[PDB]
Design an enzyme around this catalytic site. Structure first.
Site, PDB file in Angstrom:
ATOM      1  CD  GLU A 787      27.968   9.842   6.972  1.00 27.76           C
ATOM      2  OE1 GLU A 787      27.214  10.307   7.821  1.00 27.76           O
ATOM      3  OE2 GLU A 787      27.578   9.871   5.733  1.00 27.76           O
ATOM      4  CB  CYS A 821      24.350  12.694   7.005  1.00 25.48           C
ATOM      5  SG  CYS A 821      25.464  13.230   5.759  1.00 25.48           S
TER       6      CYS A 821
HETATM    7  N1  LIG Z   1      28.157  10.779   8.032  1.00 26.24           N
HETATM    8  C1  LIG Z   1      27.492  10.356   6.773  1.00 26.24           C
HETATM    9  O1  LIG Z   1      28.015  10.600   5.546  1.00 26.24           O
HETATM   10  C2  LIG Z   1      26.092   9.898   6.626  1.00 26.24           C
HETATM   11  C3  LIG Z   1      25.243   9.853   5.247  1.00 26.24           C
HETATM   12  C4  LIG Z   1      24.051   9.465   5.391  1.00 26.24           C
HETATM   13  C5  LIG Z   1      23.388   9.327   6.512  1.00 26.24           C
HETATM   14  N2  LIG Z   1      23.926   9.106   7.622  1.00 26.24           N
HETATM   15  C6  LIG Z   1      23.148   8.845   8.916  1.00 26.24           C
HETATM   16  O2  LIG Z   1      22.340   7.837   8.568  1.00 26.24           O
HETATM   17  C7  LIG Z   1      21.209   7.998   9.356  1.00 26.24           C
HETATM   18  C8  LIG Z   1      19.940   7.796   8.778  1.00 26.24           C
HETATM   19  O3  LIG Z   1      19.935   6.547   7.801  1.00 26.24           O
HETATM   20  P1  LIG Z   1      19.336   5.274   8.282  1.00 26.24           P
HETATM   21  O4  LIG Z   1      18.013   5.496   8.724  1.00 26.24           O
HETATM   22  O5  LIG Z   1      19.229   4.429   7.153  1.00 26.24           O
HETATM   23  O6  LIG Z   1      20.286   4.776   9.318  1.00 26.24           O
HETATM   24  P2  LIG Z   1      20.285   3.272   9.870  1.00 26.24           P
HETATM   25  O7  LIG Z   1      21.032   3.035  11.035  1.00 26.24           O
HETATM   26  O8  LIG Z   1      18.741   3.407  10.145  1.00 26.24           O
HETATM   27  O9  LIG Z   1      20.208   2.504   8.858  1.00 26.24           O
HETATM   28  C9  LIG Z   1      21.105   2.101   8.030  1.00 26.24           C
HETATM   29  C10 LIG Z   1      21.370   0.737   7.623  1.00 26.24           C
HETATM   30  O10 LIG Z   1      21.842  -0.163   8.787  1.00 26.24           O
HETATM   31  C11 LIG Z   1      20.969  -1.390   8.612  1.00 26.24           C
HETATM   32  N3  LIG Z   1      20.799  -1.737   9.971  1.00 26.24           N
HETATM   33  C12 LIG Z   1      19.732  -1.635  11.048  1.00 26.24           C
HETATM   34  N4  LIG Z   1      20.257  -2.318  12.200  1.00 26.24           N
HETATM   35  C13 LIG Z   1      21.272  -2.985  11.668  1.00 26.24           C
HETATM   36  C14 LIG Z   1      21.757  -4.208  12.627  1.00 26.24           C
HETATM   37  N5  LIG Z   1      21.437  -4.507  14.158  1.00 26.24           N
HETATM   38  N6  LIG Z   1      23.028  -4.585  12.200  1.00 26.24           N
HETATM   39  C15 LIG Z   1      23.491  -4.473  10.893  1.00 26.24           C
HETATM   40  N7  LIG Z   1      22.820  -3.502  10.134  1.00 26.24           N
HETATM   41  C16 LIG Z   1      21.675  -2.894  10.480  1.00 26.24           C
HETATM   42  C17 LIG Z   1      19.794  -0.900   8.033  1.00 26.24           C
HETATM   43  O11 LIG Z   1      19.194  -1.908   7.483  1.00 26.24           O
HETATM   44  C18 LIG Z   1      20.095   0.161   7.068  1.00 26.24           C
HETATM   45  O12 LIG Z   1      20.496  -0.598   5.827  1.00 26.24           O
HETATM   46  C19 LIG Z   1      21.311   9.317  10.183  1.00 26.24           C
HETATM   47  O13 LIG Z   1      21.621   9.198  11.453  1.00 26.24           O
HETATM   48  C20 LIG Z   1      22.188   9.890   9.124  1.00 26.24           C
HETATM   49  O14 LIG Z   1      22.880  11.073   9.862  1.00 26.24           O
HETATM   50  C21 LIG Z   1      25.395   9.583   7.817  1.00 26.24           C
END
Ligand SMILES: NC(=O)c1ccc[n+]([C@@H]2O[C@H](COP(=O)([O-])OP(=O)(O)OC[C@H]3O[C@@H](n4cnc5c(N)ncnc54)[C@H](O)[C@@H]3O)[C@@H](O)[C@H]2O)c1
Ligand SMILES: Cc1cc2nc3c(=O)[nH]c(=O)nc-3n(C[C@H](O)[C@H](O)[C@H](O)COP(=O)(O)OP(=O)(O)OC[C@H]3O[C@@H](n4cnc5c(N)ncnc54)[C@H](O)[C@@H]3O)c2cc1C
Ligand SMILES: COc1ccc(CO)cc1
EC number: 1.5.5.2
Lengths: 1206, 168, 56
Positions: A787, A821
């Site tokens: 997501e 989001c």
């Molecule tokens: N569609 C939905 O339901 C929904 C809900 C909440 C947030 N979001 C999205 O979340 C984003 C913001 O959240 P965020 O800043 O925590 O996102 P993100 O991609 O920054 O971080 C999410 C997670 O992924 C991890 N991560 C980062 N790099 C990685 C890698 N190379 N390999 C594996 N894991 C890795 C991080 O440690 C973190 O736990 C926004 O784009 C938002 O729209 C979507």
């Protein structure tokens, strides 16, 4: 550094015994409220007999004596009557009465009739039919208007104009201006009536609007006082004001601004009322403003500058459970102040809204009664209290109910003098009743007419709904005109009717308590009432205590806590505020965790599904019980406000209970687990999304590696602690705090059987690329549920209600500093209303309180990190440097210790100006011409995102158009676009916004097992017709087995599923399954292709078939219907975006294709793979669940200012 | 298994007046009624005796021209300017009409683009009404696309208007 | 019954729709079958007449 929560929500004053008795009654069970009301309202048999006789005489008079006659004279349908009245209203918007007449004669009547003519048709529909709709069928109305004009011509148009003029200028309002209203009042004042004038106005959204309402009131007080000419407060006219008109932030959360800014304004108006010696009444509004208004009443009545004047008045609502205790407080305040407070007893005007609000907020009970007869008893009981206190208060009995009137008339007895008490009624509704009351020849009791004044189309619409009781069948106004309702029915004594019921005070059988919204399926999460002083006092202490705790997060492996590098966790709103310590996971221990999960996978899969679900339910109980402490951690660790933290804990509870119930409905021993599931969660919903992914994976029978966002490990550790306390074994749920390197190690681990990811699209793409190199032991792709972002738009046309739009936009764009989001990123305003809405939006922007979130008064907290702040600010400055208009609120110096971005509005020229998701409090605004609506929807779709989308319109044709063309997973009509509710708005989108299935929806668990179950209610009687054409083509080609499989796919598909989900009143929550789009087919054999095509067609999709398969000669002579859906693709990246993929081959071919698909630009494709043999053996080789697209639509059906069904 | 081909065989006569289906199964009802091309459908009852204003009567193909007798479009065929029948509207807009209007705007054909949008709104395609009748019966009246319309234009603008009318 | 219903239905539809701008075609020839020699006879004729056309 201020101590955390030391100033969270201090009350305006220490709460007296009388004040606490009020608060105690706020949500008291209805069976506890009614018996003492029944007792207090009890009257002698002789009085009850006398009252019934008086009520009968009044009703007989009432029944023994406009639009209806117009409908009769011209044989109008209901729709023609509504359409005609809309036309009349528009024609009256033309000033020059001569220019209007020639328009009617030379243009309208012939055959040629920025805003729909029918924007206010809901109001006229209520006038014509007595029924309220939220939205208007403007095509039906246009057809009706054409029909009636072509049939009856100019005469019916002139009759409609005359009728609308008589209603809008004489029946709904006493006058268009206070001067006109005062002139029109002389007639009834001569007959013994008095007046209270209401300058139409409430719910200021900006300082400018509050200032406009203030000067309206001030000018009206001068005019009323000049006309009163020394008649005094009882015989002369008064004014009625709404506190919400005088300040844009009139709420308990903003009590300090209310006392500091609103109170002096009311004092200044009251000082003017004092100088003229007229009444000034404070109208009663929503239940969560009642007790706050008492603080203003108390200060005003104790203020020596207002002494000598007894005109201050105050409404109390008898439909409210606190009413008698409020009256005790007011009567005591009258004694302390020596002021004879004027007390208007009403039943109450916000009933439908109060039911919906309590349900939305998950509160213990309603703050109003739920049976109408209970309000009637409450009113009579409260009247008895007031009639015992006429020496110290002036009771004003506002009612149009002849039974209520007669009961109080006889209760009051024979001694009367002007000034003892009075009745009150509404202009253009109460005069027929009260002309049987006022005067020596009747009952000789005075009546004050509440007299609306103005031309405000919006406020006029609000009033017509209040005047007609939103078209309620229970209302006296409806029943008096109902010929099926006898007089004996109308004079039934509510006190004795209630006394005779089996359970005195039983709640309405057809209204669910908030906890019971989902019936037997599951228990709704419970919230907290931040307007309740007892709640605020207890929460303050719980929040302070949460901040004293030494929160920690450690790598929690199956073998115990692991060692690692430890760092502090800081409050994003104040880096001096240390929240806890996190010990982060080494890459080696992350790999070890996956091996431990793999070793423990059989043991957890062996726990029966109902017992796994019981763990989730127990964890939900624990989270509910621990909610105040969890709030405090979320507030400080994640920078969230209290209200948002409550919603987050509620959502986590709802996920746990929803996935538990879904498990109980579906999972059996044949739905085997995937194996270890890596759950990677974001910092912006650090408990709810964290819990949801993990709970689903666990309850589906998989052990979980939980990797929380590096910014928010503490609440994750607490969630794991709670799940383990609820019975999840340590080997089934391991916590791995750390950064993306920890996430990457988990994703890459050979035993990782599935990944659940919520976060950025870019990280999801990196994860997809790593997963594409691996296959499951069964030779299938590793499932990824991702997501990701949105570029969420709201479209607002010229029929929308600006004040509603502004509130929904401010909330959607800036709640949680835009770190949802679902947050509104692009507001699209129809050109004709853009400037007015934008002005209001900017005004509302500047009323937001930004700061450290351990204060109830803070609306918008910090962004999560300095890097987030820097990224957002760079975008703002780039926009500003390009010459775009940028509006920002000024931040207080105190924000300097944290990472804050001010809420920001940026006016764009084109949607293409915005190139990426900006995850912060930044609203972009574009304007569009009405005729470009369809191209606008194309532009919104062209971002490639498809998460949330809002539409504000009253027009059914626009709803049908826009919602049929927008491509987003969560649609919201006439409401905000945030805060999706589990199992009510299943949440998740398409395109760049993710893979599906929706979280909090019925397809979610099925992605987490190797054989998907049949979800509840998951079927469709619709069969795709191109599928059927294809199956016939297969039979024609001799592909008999494939034709049978195709027909079977057509039946098994749930394409066309169309469900309404249980939720709150005043909202319709719909869940539908559509085609995904164009599916990439990568077949290996002819039969494989036919099975793939049948799967895609049965789910409504088109296809692009790999041209390199060499199978072009297998699709000769297709029916045109099928050929239209089939394209051939050599360059897959050139022919997208696709919405999924079906692959046939052995393991090496599947891997090679899966890697090629992961390299396609754009959306992450949900890929399904099968060998040729699996296609031959298994009818479900390709799962049709993943070939449809879920869409959730939430429609606010209270938006036309009322709930019809309720 | 031959049900869909059977429906084709029924349609292949070129007639399309009355049609009956006896089944207890909603999926069969949805399947068959979505594929049969007849003007008067009857489910779990006889197929005769159409009641005026309850089963407006008439079909397509070799069964005749329409409009249906005993239905709300009938009188409009007998005047030179048709009136708007009662309840005759739809909130549905054909999406290909909409795509055509955008294409017209792109080419600068602003008058035809507006004409196309107006046709899109004025169309009653998608009308779906329940007519009053006896208890124990549901009598439904719906407006669908006719099929493929022959366009015989003389001018480019005429073609654009004809296409808008047909697409709407 | 069907003839009665045609008469009353086309009468009501006329009352709902027809005004002066809905001009008649002119003489309408109504040709009817032997299998519904009153009902279809009456239906075609009634519709043509009430739409303002004289009937053969
Ligand atoms: N569609 C939905 O339901 C929904 C809900 C909440 C947030 N979001 C999205 O979340 C984003 C913001 O959240 P965020 O800043 O925590 O996102 P993100 O991609 O920054 O971080 C999410 C997670 O992924 C991890 N991560 C980062 N790099 C990685 C890698 N190379 N390999 C594996 N894991 C890795 C991080 O440690 C973190 O736990 C926004 O784009 C938002 O729209 C979507
Ligand atoms: C002069 C005047 C001033 C007023 N000022 C205010 C004000 O400042 N604030 C305000 O909130 N109202 C105010 N009202 C009241 C409100 O606007 C309605 O007029 C009033 O509630 C109608 O009550 P009734 O005795 O006329 O009619 P009734 O038909 O006897 O009573 C209807 C009322 O019953 C209640 N009710 C309906 N259904 C249910 C149910 N299922 N369960 C429990 N209760 C139910 C509602 O309060 C509803 O309005 C005022 C009314 C008047 C006449
Ligand atoms: C319809 O009469 C009303 C008067 C005052 C209020 C206060 O909101 C509501 C209704």
């Amino acid at each position: 550094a201020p101590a955390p929560f030391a100033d969270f929500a201090p009350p305006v004053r220490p709460q007296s015994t009388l004040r606490r008795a009020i608060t105690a009654a706020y949500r008291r069970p209805e069976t506890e409220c009614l018996p003492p009301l029944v007792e207090a309202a009890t009257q002698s048999k002789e009085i009850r007999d006398a009252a019934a006789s008086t009520a009968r005489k009044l009703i007989e008079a009432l029944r023994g004596k406009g639009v209806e006659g117009l409908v009769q004279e011209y044989s109008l349908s209901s729709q023609e009557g509504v359409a005609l009245m809309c036309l009349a209203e528009a024609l009256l918007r033309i000033p020059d009465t001569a220019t209007r007449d020639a328009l009617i004669r030379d243009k309208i009547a012939d055959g040629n009739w920025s805003r729909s003519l029918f924007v206010n048709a809901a109001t006229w529909g209520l006038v014509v039919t007595g029924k309220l709709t939220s939205t208007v069928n403007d095509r039906s109305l246009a057809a009706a208007l054409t029909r009636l004009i072509s049939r009856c011509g100019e005469p019916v148009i002139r009759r409609g104009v005359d009728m609308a003029m008589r209603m809008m200028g004489e029946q709904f309002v006493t006058g268009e201006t206070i001067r006109e209203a005062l002139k029109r009042s002389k007639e009834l004042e001569e007959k013994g009536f008095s007046y209270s004038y209401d300058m139409l106005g409430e719910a200021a959204t900006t300082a400018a609007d509050a200032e406009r309402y203030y000067r309206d009131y001030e000018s009206a007080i001068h005019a009323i006082g000049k006309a009163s000419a020394g008649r005094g407060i009882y015989e002369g006219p008064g004014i009625s004001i709404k506190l919400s008109a005088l300040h844009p932030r009139y709420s308990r959360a903003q009590a300090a601004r209310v006392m500091g800014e609103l109170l002096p304004r009311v004092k200044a108006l009251a000082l003017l009322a004092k100088n003229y010696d007229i009444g000034l009444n404070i109208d009663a509004e929503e239940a969560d403003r009642l007790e706050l208004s008492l603080d203003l009443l108390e200060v005003l009545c104790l203020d020596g500058d207002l002494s000598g004047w007894n005109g201050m008045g105050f409404v109390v609502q008898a439909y409210g459970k606190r009413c008698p205790f409020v009256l005790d407080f007011i009567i005591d305040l009258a004694r302390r102040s020596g002021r004879r407070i004027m007390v208007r007893l009403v039943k109450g005007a916000y009933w439908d809204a109060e039911i919906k609000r309590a349900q939305l907020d998950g509160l213990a009970d309603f703050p109003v009664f739920t049976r109408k007869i209970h309000t009637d008893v409450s009113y009579i009981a409260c009247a008895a209290k007031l009639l015992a206190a006429t020496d110290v208060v002036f009771p004003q009995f506002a009612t149009h109910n002849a039974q209520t009137l007669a009961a109080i008339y006889h209760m009051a007895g024979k001694d009367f003098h002007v000034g003892k008490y009075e009745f009150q009624c509404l202009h253009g509704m109460g005069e027929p009743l009260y002309e049987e009351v006022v005067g020596r020849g009747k009952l000789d009791r005075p009546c004050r007419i509440y007299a609306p004044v103005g031309t405000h189309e919006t406020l006029l619409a609000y009033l017509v709904r209040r005047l007609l009781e939103n078209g309620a069948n229970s209302s006296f106004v409806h029943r008096i005109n109902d010929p099926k309702v006898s007089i004996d029915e109308l004079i039934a004594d509510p006190v004795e009717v209630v006394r005779a019921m089996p359970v005195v005070g039983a709640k309405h059988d057809r209204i669910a308590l908030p906890a019971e919204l989902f019936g037997d399926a599951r228990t709704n999460s419970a919230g907290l009432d931040l307007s309740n002083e007892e709640t605020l006092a207890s929460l303050t202490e719980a929040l302070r205590e949460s901040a004293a705790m030494k929160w920690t997060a450690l790598p929690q492996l199956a073998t115990g806590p692991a060692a690692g590098e430890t760092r502090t966790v800081l409050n994003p709103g104040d880096h001096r505020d240390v929240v806890g310590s996190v010990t982060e996971t080494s890459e080696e221990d992350a790999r070890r965790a996956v091996r431990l999960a793999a070793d423990a996978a059989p043991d957890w899969a062996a726990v029966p599904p109902s017992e796994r679900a019981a763990c989730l339910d127990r964890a939900a109980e624990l989270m509910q019980a621990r909610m105040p402490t969890l709030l405090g951690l979320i507030i400080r660790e994640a920078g969230k406000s209290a209200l948002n933290a409550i919603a987050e804990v509620r959502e986590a509870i709802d996920f746990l209970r929803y996935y538990a119930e879904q498990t109980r409905r579906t999972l059996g021993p044949g739905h085997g687990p995937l194996g270890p599931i890596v759950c990677i969660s974001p910092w912006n919903f650090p408990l709810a999304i964290f819990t949801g992914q993990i709970a689903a994976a666990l309850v589906a029978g998989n052990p979980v590696l939980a990797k929380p966002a590096e910014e928010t490990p503490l609440i994750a550790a607490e969630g794991v602690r709670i799940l383990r306390e609820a019975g999840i074994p340590a080997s089934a749920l391991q916590l791995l705090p750390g950064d993306g390197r920890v996430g990457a190690a988990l994703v890459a681990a050979a035993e990782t059987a599935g990944v659940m990811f919520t976060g950025s699209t870019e990280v999801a793409r990196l994860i997809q690329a790593q997963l594409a190199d691996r296959l499951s032991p069964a030779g299938r792709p590793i499932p990824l549920i991702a997501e990701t972002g949105g570029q969420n738009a709201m479209i607002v046309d010229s029929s929308a209600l600006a004040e509603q739009v502004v509130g929904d936009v401010i909330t959607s764009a800036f709640d949680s500093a835009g770190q949802r989001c679902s947050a509104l990123r692009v507001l699209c305003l129809q050109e004709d209303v853009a400037d007015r809405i934008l002005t209001m939006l900017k005004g509302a922007l500047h009323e937001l309180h930004i700061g450290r979130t351990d204060r109830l008064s803070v609306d918008v907290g910090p962004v999560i990190t300095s890097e987030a702040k820097d990224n957002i600010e760079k975008h703002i400055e780039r926009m500003r440097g390009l010459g775009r208009k940028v509006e920002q609120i000024g931040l207080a110096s105190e924000t300097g210790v944290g990472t804050f971005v001010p809420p920001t509005i940026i006016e764009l020229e084109k949607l293409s100006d915005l190139q990426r998701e900006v995850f912060g409090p930044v609203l972009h605004v574009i304007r569009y011409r009405r005729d470009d609506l369809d191209r606008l929807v194309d532009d919104v779709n062209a971002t490639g995102y498809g998460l949330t989308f809002g539409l504000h319109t009253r027009l059914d044709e626009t709803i049908a158009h826009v919602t049929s063309r927008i491509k987003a997973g969560n649609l919201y009509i006439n409401r905000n676009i945030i805060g999706a509710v589990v199992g009510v708005q299943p949440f998740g989108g398409r395109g760049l916004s993710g893979t599906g299935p929706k979280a909090g929806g019925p397809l979610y668990l099925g992605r987490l097992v190797t054989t998907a179950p049949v979800p509840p209610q998951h079927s469709s009687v619709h069969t795709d017709p191109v599928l059927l054409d294809f199956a016939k083509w297969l039979d024609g080609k001799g592909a008999r087995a494939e034709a049978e499989a195709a027909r079977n796919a057509g039946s098994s598909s749930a394409l066309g599923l169309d469900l309404e989900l249980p939720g709150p009143v005043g909202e319709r929550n719909l869940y539908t399954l559509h085609a995904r789009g164009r599916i990439l087919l990568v077949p290996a054999t002819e039969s494989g292709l036919y099975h793939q095509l049948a799967a895609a067609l049965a789910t409504g999709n088109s296809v692009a078939i790999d041209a390199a398969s060499g199978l072009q000669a297998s699709l000769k002579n297709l029916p045109q219907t099928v050929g239209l859906r089939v394209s051939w693709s050599k360059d897959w990246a050139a022919d997208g975006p696709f919405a999924g993929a079906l692959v046939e081959g052995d393991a090496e071919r599947i891997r090679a294709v899966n890697k090629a698909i992961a390299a396609l630009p754009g959306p992450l494709l949900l890929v399904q793979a099968a060998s040729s043999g699996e296609i031959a053996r298994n009818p479900d080789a390709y799962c049709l669940n993943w070939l449809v697209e879920e869409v959730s639509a939430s429609i606010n059906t209270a938006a036309a200012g009322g709930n019809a069904s309720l």
